[PDB]
Design a protein around this ligand. Structure first.
Ligand code: ANP
Ligand code: ANP
Ligand code: K
Ligand code: K
Ligand code: MG
Ligand code: MG
Lengths: 614, 55, 612, 56
């Protein structure tokens, strides 16, 4: 099954010619106005960006010669009865030649040539937005008649006009009484009449171009007073300015508990600010990342890229970077290499910032870890690289048996007080320290002088087994250690032992004797304690014990076993009920019971019949 | 209560208390729509938005 | 006053000149080169689409003449020695005036002229992909020089040669020895030589244009090897082909249990297939393998979620020839049409499961046990009331008035409900054995109403979030008891207040209830459904107490035993009172972690048994 | 229940009445009386829960 017709019979016979590429001016307008911009109201973001560039060029022209700067304004006007929108600025304007060499050519921008003649690329390159040269034609998505009044800012120019309908032909004429600047009139389409009300227009100016560098007045009142604080050095912004900015972006009335101001340029240009809310996280935080990308002070509207790791979705802020590339739709080049390494750079800085906060303050960090501790545990579960797992693990907090109650210890702090050559870490799961010290598993491990961590909140067992390594040290649970290591007379015990081998031959697969108990009647040991504790939650009693292999232990010194001895002679009927309850008591003490409702019926039967002699 | 809107920075043991601008003395063309809502939430001691705004 | 400068002082006084729009191709090529496509390997997909279009034009010309058709196949080669990739086909071919008109003009395509000159819109309107005219120029991303050799299919046409470097200038010359069809020689750039390896090329071909309608080859080895059954009718395709297709889309090895062939064109053209796996849902389950197609080429959306979130377990492929596409051949985000496509598929899938339940009652029972989680999730994650009820019809519960081992839906439950009653009663318990013996069921045993038993977890949350069915309220047994309206009184009341002195810290209010037969005590609260979740939802996640009304049965032996225990052993009586509270707490489902009660339980039996 | 289901949510019987064919009982009657005057049958009865009792 191999055949092809590829050969080298091709050759040139006649004299070669030369030609140049042309372009079709009608389909290009159709493509831009139909299958380029997904959302409709992006046509005023381009118009505002164009207005903010004319003002920037004029300001640069009046500082080289040291002239006085006049007023710089951007004015928006909406009409209902006429159904028209209006944009006006006070920029450099355009001459007769500039109205045809820029507005009449597709993919041609005059702002690009302005920077090419600067030979500096220091202050104006970071303040000019125009890059492609097709953003003006976005007005045709909602317009049938476009009307432009513009005259140059040169001392002695003449007013002009510009009319078109998007059919490939445009007419240009002269006008009288035109103010210096540029005014554009747009006639809305029949089905695009939603852009004639203040409610619709206000929802777009704030969303896209709220932080424009020049004052913006919408129908009389301005909306451009709050300044962008993520650009200047952190030494210029006070505590109040940080507080005010957080309330706007997060739409919250409280005070942030943490603030980060990151500014780096050697690896890549990054300007960003991050906030941690003071209030306890709500359920909307868990259910999906509160960070909006900004490039040259205009929204990028990512909403689908998740530039920050999913476990860091609880912080609010903005990120500004001019090194990221953008496509023709003014959106990210998805899954690009540059946008991937930015997340790794941002992730390592945030983890380092939290670690420094712990050293600076411990009581404040303890409150924060109690509230936002869920996200850190999730990040460990949903990570791949061990270096990522170990970095997050430094933020975890536990308490140990070698320290007084109520005091939290870090893993690193625990990792500094072992013996000479013991590469083991011991941890135990319990709801409270009261049950942790009274747990039968801990009582068996009192034979050794070692420090064991006490993790209380849920998912701790799941998190530790997923970490699986910390500083080349193995994490071993207390229950694992008991299995893996390698009164009543003897006559009175051997006769007792055969009973539960038969009466509990279904739910019990192993019964042994252990002296390591002092306050508990029985012990239940299982090989894979960690797996069994969590596989049970994912998923009757006979099935729950068939694959569990519930090895059972007894305490000969305990009075319960001592009292069960005479239970043979007096009332053998009660003996079966008692041994069943002891097994159920050990199962609950071992945490291998999903729900105790089933055993309630047997408990009532034993009590109402055993204590009748009172 | 008394001198919240003083025209100069005020410090008490290091921190500052003013943290607000007197928007009734500024021109309507120099104050944005965002400060018009935060100021209202302070004088009215509420958490809603105003439906009218006369300057 | 409002600071505005907008006025109407402008006027027109000059002469009107006429001009036409222009465009510079030096910058237009710049935009397509790097600011159009996110990926770098999409150039081969465009070339394959172009090659297939050439064969389609040739075929339609033959049927007009009604003559025999020659060979029709696509070949692509990789030459790792000098680092070149070549694509050849046997299409119509292009003349010297066709080269400059099509290749040398941006945003101009000759396909549209052929499509607009069809006058039937059925012969080729469903098999032509090209609609923009900028696809060819995507090859400039990785190519520093492009060689094109082509001869038209006309009996007498000559070959021609086409050179360009992406700098805005191209060259055309007459070529000799070029066979019929089209051949494209592409020289790879230094940084993009990875495409000279066969492994990289094989990945892209099977990722984008695996289901092309023509025999495609790679180094002479055919790669298609199967057909696209989603475009065919349900009757011609056999079960074996219906089985081979499933193993490819899902990358599975088992056989499907369900198969739906959906084909409608009235609201919008749909030719889609769906599959339900046989194995139990995997851990990863909890574009969802429903990858959208258009003209038999992948669109690769993976974000629009054409299918509802709760429908993330079924497989298949969706095909449509009217989806609006971006200039980069991606789906137009947030479109009106795509929203109506999602709703249409949701209705058909829900209807399909309803029909499968009536046709096969036993088969649907096994299916419900495996994928029951997804249906419950969709009810909670819905917003419209109507769509919640549509999913609710698929649920299956067990009623008290029926023998064990059978399940009944909610629609037929209302068809057997009395006229006066206008609500549905449900009870939560692990098994039916623990449901019948539950004290709440025995409290409602007085009436002749019917109550459903729900076993699997989050059932109460599903009913709580639904709250309606056929405009009939859903009220649980726990909810109905609170809204409803031998231990002499002197002996009982004096001992009754004893419980208040020792259980007033937890039990805010306490009373005596006589509708019990075997349970010594009960625990009741107003919002039983909310409390059974809230007290468990807080303990699950550290995110953003109550008034437990305890009832005492005076005719129970255990309660009767406490009468003669206060006078004899006041110390031991306190142990028994607390244990009874814990026992009633567990049966109500509001208990905390049962590890705490183990210590107190052991201490009671060690002393209470110290008499034998 | 068939003809007053929109306005009546429950109907019962009282044997303690002998001079009035109808009786309305509400959980919080005192609160409802004063709150109703400050603030057509359907939306009023929704917030009052007008249980109806008829002497046979
Ligand atoms: N309001 C305006 N006042 C003055 N000059 C303008 C104005 N709008 C556009 N221009 C000029 O006309 C050119 C074409 O507009 P435009 O299509 O927006 O190009 P661009 O904005 O620079 N690049 P893009 O990012 O695609 O918008 C601009 O580059 C400017 O030189
Ligand atoms: N191999 C080919 N054989 C014949 N005609 C071709 C071939 N490649 C390109 N053409 C023609 O040249 C035009 C330009 O190519 P192309 O850029 O793919 O436009 P298109 O495919 O029609 N629209 P698009 O979806 O963007 O590819 C095509 O429309 C065809 O008419
Ligand atoms: K332009
Ligand atoms: K073309
Ligand atoms: Mg622009
Ligand atoms: Mg094409």
């Amino acid at each position: 099954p191999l055949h092809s017709i590829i050969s080298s019979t091709e050759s040139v016979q006649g004299s070669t010619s030369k030609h140049e590429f042309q372009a079709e001016t009608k389909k290009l307008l159709d493509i831009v106005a139909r299958s380029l911009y997904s959302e409709k109201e992006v046509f005023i973001r381009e118009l505002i960006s164009n207005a903010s560039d004319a003002l920037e060029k004029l300001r640069h022209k009046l500082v080289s010669d040291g002239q006085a700067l006049p007023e710089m304004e951007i004015h928006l006007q909406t009409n209902a009865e006429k159904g028209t929108i209006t944009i006006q600025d006070t920029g450099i304007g355009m001459t007769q030649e500039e109205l045809v060499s820029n507005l009449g050519t597709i993919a041609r921008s005059g702002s690009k040539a302005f920077l090419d003649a600067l030979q500096n690329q220091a202050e104006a390159s970071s303040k000019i937005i125009g890059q492609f040269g097709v953003g003006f034609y976005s007005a045709f998505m909602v317009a049938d008649r476009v009307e432009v009044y513009s005259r140059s800012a040169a001392p002695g120019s003449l007013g002009y006009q510009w009319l078109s309908d998007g059919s490939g032909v445009f007419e240009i004429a002269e006008a009288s009484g035109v103010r210096t600047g540029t005014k554009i009139i747009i006639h809305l389409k029949s089905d695009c009449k939603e852009f004639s009300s203040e409610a619709r227009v206000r929802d777009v100016v704030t969303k896209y171009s709220n932080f424009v560098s020049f004052p913006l007045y919408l129908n009389g009142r301005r909306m451009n007073t709050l300044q962008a604080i993520w650009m200047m050095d952190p030494k210029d912004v006070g505590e109040w300015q940080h507080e005010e900015f957080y309330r706007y972006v997060a739409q919250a009335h409280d005070k942030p508990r943490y603030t980060l101001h990151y500014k780096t340029d050697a690896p890549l240009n990054i300007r960003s600010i991050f906030y941690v809310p003071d209030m306890k996280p709500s359920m909307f935080d868990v259910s999906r990342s509160s960070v909006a990308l900004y490039s040259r002070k205009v929204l990028i509207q990512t909403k689908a890229t998740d530039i920050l790791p999913k476990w860091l979705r609880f912080i609010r802020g903005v990120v500004d970077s001019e090194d990221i590339p953008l496509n023709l739709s003014r959106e990210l080049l998805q899954e690009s290499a540059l946008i991937r390494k930015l997340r790794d750079v941002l992730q390592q800085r945030l983890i380092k910032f939290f670690i420094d906060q712990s050293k600076k303050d411990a009581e404040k960090y303890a409150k924060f870890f109690e509230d936002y501790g869920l996200f850190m545990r999730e990040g460990i579960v949903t990570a791949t690289e061990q270096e990522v797992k170990e970095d997050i693990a430094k933020l975890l907090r536990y308490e140990s048996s070698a320290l007084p109650s109520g005091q939290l210890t870090s893993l690193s702090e625990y990792a500094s007080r072992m013996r000479a050559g013991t590469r083991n870490i011991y941890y135990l799961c319990a709801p409270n320290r009261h049950l942790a010290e009274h747990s039968p598993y801990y009582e068996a491990m009192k034979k050794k002088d070692t420090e064991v961590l006490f993790c209380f909140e849920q998912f701790d067992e799941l998190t530790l087994l997923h970490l699986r390594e910390f500083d080349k040290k193995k994490l071993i649970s207390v229950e694992t250690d008991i299995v893996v290591d390698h009164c009543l007379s003897e006559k009175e015990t051997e006769e007792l032992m055969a009973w539960m081998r038969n009466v509990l031959g279904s739910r019990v697969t192993n019964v042994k004797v252990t002296l390591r108990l002092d306050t508990h009647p029985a012990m239940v040991t299982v090989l894979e304690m960690g797996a069994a504790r969590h596989f049970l939650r994912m998923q009757t009693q006979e099935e729950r014990a068939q694959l569990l292999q519930p090895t059972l232990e007894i305490n000969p010194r305990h009075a319960l076993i001592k009292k069960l001895n005479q239970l043979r002679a007096s009332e053998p009927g009660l003996a079966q009920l008692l041994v069943d309850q002891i097994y159920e008591n050990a199962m609950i003490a071992a945490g291998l019971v999903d729900d105790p409702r089933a055993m309630v019926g047997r408990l009532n039967e034993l009590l109402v019949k055993a204590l009748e002699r009172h | 209560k008394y001198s919240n809107f003083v025209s100069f920075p005020l410090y008490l043991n290091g921190r500052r208390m003013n943290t607000l601008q007197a928007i009734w003395m500024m021109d309507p063309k120099d104050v944005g729509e965002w400060q018009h809502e935060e100021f209202y939430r302070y004088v009215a001691q509420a958490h809603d938005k105003p439906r009218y705004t006369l300057h």
